[model samples]
Target: PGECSVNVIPKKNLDKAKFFSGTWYETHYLDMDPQATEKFCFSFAPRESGGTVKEALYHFNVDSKVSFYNTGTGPLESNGAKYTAKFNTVDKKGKEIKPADEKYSYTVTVIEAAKQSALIHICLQEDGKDIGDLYSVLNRNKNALPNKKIKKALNKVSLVLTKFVVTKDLDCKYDDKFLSSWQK
Candidate 1:
């Protein structure tokens, strides 16, 4: 009934290995609207399993430090823009691990990328139609702000960073309760 097209936004080519090899601070995230308006952090590095896959760690200070771990792999369909991560095995305070829970995937359409910054559209689609989208502007330095162009692009996607809460840092301590289980 409404305009629902993926072409309304632009797609970008990213270096899978280099683009995801380090820490990315969550400048902001969106669900139907802004959800977690607090500090959050994510780290990605080569999986100890030692393959093309990379392990991702998520952290938050909700009640007194919480964490999650997942594994992601892909250039999903060859040309890029798609990647899948498994969340079923997430370890939250020694919760039962379910390796077959479900796969969490995202279509990343980068607006701009560099060693220091990246602005991208994290889209959720089904059968070639957009279900929803999340806009994330990341910086290597957690304290840095997004650039003018990135901010403008994010606004084009209906997200205004200024209206959202900004965090001083997304740094989270390493927790391997999850990884330790699966890596073996």
Candidate 2:
């Protein structure tokens, strides 16, 4: 699947990702099945290798405990711009496990700057769907987009990625204050 439910940190937090640089809470996500909103805590950090980060980590919360972590390598353009994002998870025993290998790229293809904030789309490819996935409003702050604006952005993500069904009117869920809990 090209998309999954995601805990989208505002682009500000994506930048904070470099500073927080470890574990933080995934405040909200849209589950594929059942398709409802849930709050979960997880961590993210750039995977370091020889002074460069090859990938990043994503851990999901389960049974009131945070476990089932995954590693996702950023597919970078030649100029070092990240256009496509990929992820997968491991088991409880710290073993690498494949969740969805070929289907889910879980990516944000097109992004542009608005007057005050930026717009982003988190998309996925499901088995039975054409061009549908997830969408989020990326801004410098938690209050980036009002409800109407969030709805508008999602509609665009749906039209552009017209193969899979993009559920509409979703916004990024997180607090405005930043955290540095990833220093471990």
Candidate 3:
């Protein structure tokens, strides 16, 4: 399968990520290939529920006003680890949410935004360490960066960000192979 230009961000940058925790207008979509293009106005909100996020609502406007309510939970591990499981929901308009229904969980990991940058964001995948390794220079908001600048960031993030993997046999060896598989 092809990789999607989506990121599952982390909660590491307490202030940075928390500031980004709230709803954000999806300014642009990051593509495998670098390009500065953004159309629709998308918004998402992260709510704090029981030390974890209980739900998130994403609403975007393109041809018409489209909205989706995702049901999920955000559980922070003892090691500051967290994953937001987003499930699709129907709006009053009854439109089937695309991409929202999947295993990748359309999420983000880290944020790169500064006050000097006018609050524009540059989010990256939350793959623990080396989070934003894809590009050398990254730009969260198109206008916040110059052509060359964004390119560099994208390259850096691409280099750092990675696809998360879940292995079934990783823990199986602990039981002297008695477990057969690890957590599968």
Candidate 4:
């Protein structure tokens, strides 16, 4: 079972109110791309209402000391499983979400989502049969202990949980400044 392919076996019967209650920290991740040059201390917050999910992201590059922010909105499926969002590149201080000279997108699937933790697998658009997903393990509390299902989720995806990189929390101070912007 040593294969690297992404399958969107999303969490079943999901309700948005339970899973998207609070901001989530990127506690760990498996970067399938071998030449990943950037790593982030990432915080994600998504609120679902009016048949859509509006998500906010705050990213701080631990190595480059560069910060980036994004706000994404997309239609939420009835099951709260798959989401493909159009994102805007926001300023460092979260002043405004200005459309960039170019744009990008991500269609993500929730592998597992619970009260304390969640596992997400992003569908990378490629026809290849190897290394097809980028996975992030999210927790509500920073440095929180992982849930038991986290391992099973990774195992189903054919990735070892222990092989993921732990995101850094050192010298991080701008989280609220970015996440709060979503309120307005």
Return the top candidate by TM-score: 4
Q: C-alpha displacement of 7 in model 3, angstroms?
A: 10
Local distance difference test values of all predictions, in order: 0.52, 0.38, 0.35, 0.72
TM-score for each model: 0.62, 0.41, 0.44, 0.83
Model 1 TM-score (2 dp): 0.62
- Worst ten in a row by lDDT for model 4: 123-132
Error of 4 at 20 (Å): 1.8
Give the distance in Å from residue 176's predicted Cα in candidate 1 to where it truly belongs: 10
Model 3, span 29-139: residue lDDT tens: 433434322223333444454556544444333334443344445454343424435455644333435444444343333334333221122222333222222211222
Between 3 and 4, whose lDDT is larger? 4
- What would the TM-score be for candidate 2 when compared with the true structure? 0.41
lDDT by residue (tens digit), candidate 4, 25-95: 87888777766757667787788887787888887887788888887777876667878676777776665
Cα shift from native, residue 157, model 3 (Å): 2.5
Model 3 TM-score, 2 decimals: 0.44
**Per-residue lDDT tens digits of candidate 1, residues 1-184?**
2122244354366566666455666565543334434455543342422233444545566435666555544344344434444333455544436563332444555566665777655555454455566556677676787777766766676667766545564355645344344343
Task: Arrange candidates, best TM-score first.
Answer: 4, 1, 3, 2
Q: In order, how many clashes per candidate?
A: 0, 14, 35, 0
Measured with C-alpha atoms, the lDDT of residue 151 in candidate 2 is 43
After aligning candidate 3 to the native by TM-score, how far in Å is the CA of 65 from where it should be? 5.3
lDDT of 4: 0.72
